[PDB]
């Protein structure tokens, strides 16, 4: 309560609308029942209005700050793991190791995937996109397991959260072995979730597969990184087709495809083309995309973003992390150092500097993947894969809320009611 | 048209509003600017909160107005053909003859769905619901037509809209088709669009089915009051995930599993069947099966309407054609006798007659289609198939707005950072 | 010459000279034409091959891929030296090879397949199962 006691709505007669306070960041002004005063506002961009209440995640902007249940992402993504991380979100405190060693065996204990699914896989394209695979297999996911949908019997909700929970894994490496023609691998409960993932992502069975230590804990740590990001475009699709009462597979479906989004045109990936394509220091920078880079052919690549001010609170351990794999793989890195030049680039670049075109976490995760054999076109579906316990925790929070059903309303601006005469046949 | 000059709000210090003016409906207070200043409203499900400006359908839920472009929805059931109307929806007027042709004879050129895409069906399980494969099929197109997936291109958004218009009947015939175990029906050119339904939807390869024009007018006219209906819980799902940047298909797979969540909840579910199982001319008569009503799931079954409050505008032409059928389908109707029973008790009854739970469009188009022997599984598909018209426009006109995407605000009220030291060691 | 064979003759009637070594009486066509026309229908078996491959792939490799695969279906006639088994054996190419071809690019644009037609001409046939659907009546441009 800084520099607001009461507001007042006024009309013609003064209306004192109460302010409330968040935990952190912004208090607000309540407008509920305006409504039921005939007094709507107008916002198309939701930039001014507050959606809702949330305990998960906390980001401050400006700040670069960017806390999960109150703890700060840096920790986490350090002395934690995706599970216990995971735990967390969906529970709002750590937990012992008994609660955490229970959790660990309820997940481990559903990472494998009906097997008429994988027939589903079939009949998808060889040469479909990782993520389109992705979306389609999720959205199929309500017409198996038809026992988790009832989204209002919190004994059917954990269920799928569970479900949901222990398959994203399996079936994004699933639509990586198929893009590629390998046969799909089978889970590992005497693994770590990322150990695994590594695992059926890489494993052949023409020999036993070794999960390197140090790309173990890159892996992990960028699947910490992702669990998610506070209110953006994704969760408030995952959180607005919730609403309705959609079945949790359909809203995580959405919230997949959504993330995808702002990734699918002519130089959407044409840009994020070059990044890969070429690999050489003096090429792809080098009085090359100074204008190059054509419509978005920025924000694709990981660098700058709308939610942080001057950096990215996830990318400072992420780069970290490139450190210590480069160095690890050797064999399998040191041309990948056309990344200190483009980095470099960003950093002192003024089409950079005035820009905001600072390297985040996708940039580091990208460099680390690039790294660990994984194509581009299963980045965003690692970084879904990871954001769905983020999306299941806030879905399972609206639902909580009391199922908060999204019918805004509409400023009609169209014709009046007009008389209808066709003279027309077929 | 009075108070319309502006407002003013203010807890500490003062800030300039205007009052906005639609063609029709209330007023409402320009607050795009307050979020600069610091200012945040709190709504909940968009409470009092107008999320666009639309010139696509005007609803006047208390007087039951209902139109579209500004034509009334019950003069376009009765004077229209669903096709004419889908124009009129997605172009702002009327079809002249020679535009209609081109509209329509488009339609019909891109009806048949990839070889491929069928093959999907075919790794569902017969006993699904054929909703739950609906969503998924839908969800899984973006697979089959990778290019335009990129919802800025105006012409990506031109043809996108097309295949979902042209294919989502095929779609749709097909599902039923696999869930009673028949083959699947291509689409005729020469039949009309609601006849082309009924074709796919009933026809064997073992003898020439004729379509009834009465039943199909019905048809026609169950799609066309189902076209579209302003802005609610699915249409606002789509909106939102386009506004993601999530590429059609997506939205309409997502939008398609909004119109379905209420008929899976359990209460609901418990009630679906209670009235679809128990009908023996000794229960419904005494209001013994009725007898029953804690878990109401009314609008479910057709009873009552969120948004209307005496009627539902679309209920007239439907409850006309209802008996216009009936009595075309001839003496083959005797479990349809609670039909006549059911709006007797509803409109006799206090209860019903106070909770208003009045026979909506859909109490009476479910009576056409199981006139028509069609499963109730197939009810809410036939609306979603019908309904994609409408999920286009809003998407369409949600695009060719501005859109400033959408990050909407939270009151977090979490924990205040904390420091994290994991009480694990696993 | 070509040039008179082009503007002057069909292909079957070519297939025949080229293949008997003498223009085609009436009857000796007809037994010619009618045979070829008995035969085009490719085993279901060999059709279910074409869906092994991706629908992605060159049309072309997919022909010298259902092609080098016949024998795999037509197991007894590989025996070169009989003078019938070649007698026979060519017949199915000379046949099937056009109901083959069509498929390909069916396969390859995502539409269904079509069955040859023992009333159109062999080359109407082709445009026939190249171009096709199961939803409008197609109409050959002679
Ligand atoms: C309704 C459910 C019981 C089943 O849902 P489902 O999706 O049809 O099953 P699913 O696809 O997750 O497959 C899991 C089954 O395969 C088993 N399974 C899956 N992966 C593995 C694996 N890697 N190693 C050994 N077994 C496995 C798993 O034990 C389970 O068997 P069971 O019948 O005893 O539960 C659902 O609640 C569930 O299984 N998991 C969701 C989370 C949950 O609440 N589970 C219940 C407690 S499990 C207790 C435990 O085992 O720790
Ligand atoms: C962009 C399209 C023309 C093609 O996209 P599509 O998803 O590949 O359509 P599709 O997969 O159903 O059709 C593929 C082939 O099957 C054909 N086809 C599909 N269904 C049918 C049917 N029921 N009857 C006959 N042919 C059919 C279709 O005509 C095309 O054959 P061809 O290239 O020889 O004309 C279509 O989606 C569309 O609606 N376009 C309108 C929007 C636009 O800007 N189109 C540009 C050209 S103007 C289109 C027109 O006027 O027809
Ligand atoms: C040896 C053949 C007759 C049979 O070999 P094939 O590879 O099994 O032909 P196929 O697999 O396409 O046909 C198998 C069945 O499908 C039938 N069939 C295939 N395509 C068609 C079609 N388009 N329309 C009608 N029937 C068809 C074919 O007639 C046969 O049915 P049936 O035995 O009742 O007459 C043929 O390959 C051929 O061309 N033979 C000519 C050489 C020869 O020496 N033939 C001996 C008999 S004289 C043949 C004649 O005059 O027709």
């Not at 198929?178 to 590594?198: H, K, T, W």
Request: aromatic letters at 10%; hydrophobic letters at 40%.
């Amino acid at each position: 309560a800084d520099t607001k006691a009461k507001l007042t709505l006024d009309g013609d007669t003064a209306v004192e609308l109460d302010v409330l306070k968040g935990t952190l960041g912004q208090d607000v002004i309540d407008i509920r029942t305006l409504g039921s005063k005939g007094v709507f506002t107008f916002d198309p961009g939701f930039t001014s209005t507050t959606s809702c209440e949330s305990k998960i995640t906390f980001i401050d902007g400006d700040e670069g700050i960017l806390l999960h249940r109150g703890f700060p992402i840096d920790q986490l993504a350090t002395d934690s793991n995706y599970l216990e991380v995971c735990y967390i979100l969906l529970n709002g405190e750590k937990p012992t190791q008994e609660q955490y060693d229970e959790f660990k065996t309820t997940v481990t204990r559903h990472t494998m995937i009906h097997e008429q699914i994988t027939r589903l896989f079939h009949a998808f394209r060889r040469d479909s996109h990782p993520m389109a695979v992705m979306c389609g297999i999720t959205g199929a996911l309500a017409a198996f397991y038809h026992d988790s949908l009832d989204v209002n019997n919190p004994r059917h909700r954990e269920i799928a959260a569970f479900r949901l929970l222990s398959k994203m894994p399996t079936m994004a490496a699933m639509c990586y072995k198929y893009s590629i023609g390998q046969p799909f691998v089978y889970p590992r409960n005497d693994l770590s979730y990322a150990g695994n993932f590594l695992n059926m992502m890489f494993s052949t069975p023409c020999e036993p597969y070794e999960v390197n230590p140090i790309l173990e804990r890159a892996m992990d740590r960028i699947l910490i990184l992702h669990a998610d990001h506070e209110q953006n475009a994704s969760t408030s699709t995952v959180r607005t087709a919730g609403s309705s009462g959609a079945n949790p597979f359909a809203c995580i479906a959405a919230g997949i495809a959504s993330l995808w989004g702002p990734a699918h045109g002519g130089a959407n990936e044409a840009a994020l083309k070059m990044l890969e394509e070429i690999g050489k220091k003096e090429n792809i920078p080098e009085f090359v995309r100074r204008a190059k880079d054509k419509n978005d052919s920025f924000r694709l690549m990981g660098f700058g973003h709308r939610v942080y001010k001057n950096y990215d609170p996830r990318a400072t351990v992420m780069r970290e992390t490139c450190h210590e794999v480069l160095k690890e793989l050797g064999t399998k890195d040191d041309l990948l150092e056309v990344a200190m030049e483009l980095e470099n680039i960003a950093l002192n670049d003024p089409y950079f500097i005035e820009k905001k075109l600072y390297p985040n976490v996708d940039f580091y995760s990208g460099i680390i993947l690039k790294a660990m054999g994984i194509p581009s076109s299963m980045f965003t579906v690692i970084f879904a894969m990871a954001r769905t316990v983020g999306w299941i925790a806030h879905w399972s929070e609206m639902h909580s809320d009391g199922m908060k059903i999204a019918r805004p309303r509409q400023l009609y601006t169209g014709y009046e009611k007009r008389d209808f005469k066709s003279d027309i046949k077929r």
